[PDB]
Design a binder for this molecule. Structure first.
Ligand SMILES: O=C(CO)[C@H](O)[C@H](O)COP(=O)(O)O
Ligand SMILES: O=C(CO)[C@H](O)[C@H](O)COP(=O)(O)O
Ligand SMILES: [Mn+2]
Ligand SMILES: [Mn+2]
Ligand SMILES: [Mn+2]
Ligand SMILES: [Mn+2]
Lengths: 216, 216
């Protein structure tokens, strides 16, 4: 069972602490949501240490649809409305209109261009016009309350950054197997081993926030 | 120079004929746009023969942001408005709001789910509600006139399908190098060799349409 499979990463508190420490060191982590939800593992990286090589890894190993998780304040600062008014997607994933950096990029898709666009959007001094729309980076609005309000990877990502003392912005992308099927827990653990990436779950995060009166 | 590099695929007419023949056989092709434009090569597949293995190849070898090129009529039939009203992206790429199949899929990202969503959207009997919005497939509206009106991969894709006698819908995604840089003409030719994919250019297509009074 999943809990058993993740015992080798530690108990849930340790799984969380190790994930926060990796983010502080500028490395990436792997977050699983609930098995009854998507049952998917996302590579997560902090924006402030994001490199081209980290972006290249997400693109060649994940779905390629790399999302920027932002606070509501930061999405508002950028004037990013939701992509659609009545979002009838399954999880109601909070996609804004997509974005490209307006300067410093060419077609927008190269790993470097995506990082340039991500760092431009996430800049606390960003202004709306720094971003052309549409583009090849996909922002997601994290709910206030984080994973204590919505058990999504979006909220997990921004919560991880805050809990780690980092700028509240991170990127994510779903781990995909070579044959196009989505990575399940055994493949996610194995990929974390290869790439020295801690593995944790939203459930670990909820327990942790609800054991250390953590309001972010 | 590029023209020289592509002489080994034939003269421009032959490059086009070989691309149309591969599509009819259900294989994929590689389309380059103008060197002064994006200078990028897209893997293109026809929707009607699209398989999970073909979708898995685009995801692990390309940007992962897989687009469905549709006619204006078909995008209208699906009630797909442009993602943004004032599109200030560089090429004014005609992104609609993104889509997922409403039935037959789980999270939407697996290669199989994307094909399910693509085949649902492209179905000539499709209705708007067959697609949830937003999602993980990105439709693009091809301009009337095709590449004789707009020299984009979008129009190249739908034009290729029509010229080949196929249903006017195809998918595309930009060929990406392992390190995240975008594939340039030498890498595109080499990738076409490996995967037995013809290579052609929008310029080949414009010449061809303007040498065989081809109005589609
Ligand atoms: O759809 C996705 C991004 O395109 C992934 O499923 C991402 O994890 C969605 O976020 P969430 O888990 O918060 O709904
Ligand atoms: O942006 C893209 C898809 O996301 C690619 O550049 C695609 O080729 C864009 O289409 P076009 O060449 O017609 O502008
Ligand atoms: Mn910020
Ligand atoms: Mn998710
Ligand atoms: Mn059609
Ligand atoms: Mn293009």
């Amino acid at each position: 069972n999943q809990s058993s499979l993740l015992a080798e990463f530690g108990d849930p508190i340790t799984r969380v602490e190790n994930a926060l420490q990796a983010l502080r060191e500028g490395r990436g982590v792997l977050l699983l949501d609930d098995e009854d939800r998507e049952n998917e593992g996302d590579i997560i990286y902090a924006v402030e240490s994001l490199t081209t090589a980290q972006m290249a890894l997400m693109i060649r190993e994940c779905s390629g649809i790399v999302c920027l998780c932002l606070t509501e304040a930061q999405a508002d600062r950028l004037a990013l409305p939701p992509m659609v008014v009545n979002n009838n997607s399954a999880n109601q994933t909070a996609f804004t209109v997509s974005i490209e950096a307006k300067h410093g990029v060419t077609t927008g898709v190269s790993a470097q261009d995506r990082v340039t666009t991500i760092k431009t959007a996430a800049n606390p001094q960003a202004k709306p016009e720094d971003l052309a729309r549409p583009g090849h980076v996909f922002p997601l609005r994290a709910r206030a309350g984080g994973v204590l309000a919505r058990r999504g990877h979006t909220e997990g990502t921004v919560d991880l950054m805050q809990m780690a003392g980092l700028q509240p912005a991170g990127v994510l992308c779903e781990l995909t197997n070579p044959d196009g099927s989505m990575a399940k827990t055994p493949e996610i653990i194995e990929f974390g081993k290869l790439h020295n990436m801690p593995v944790l779950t939203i459930e670990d995060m909820v327990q942790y926030r609800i054991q250390f009166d953590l309001k972010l």
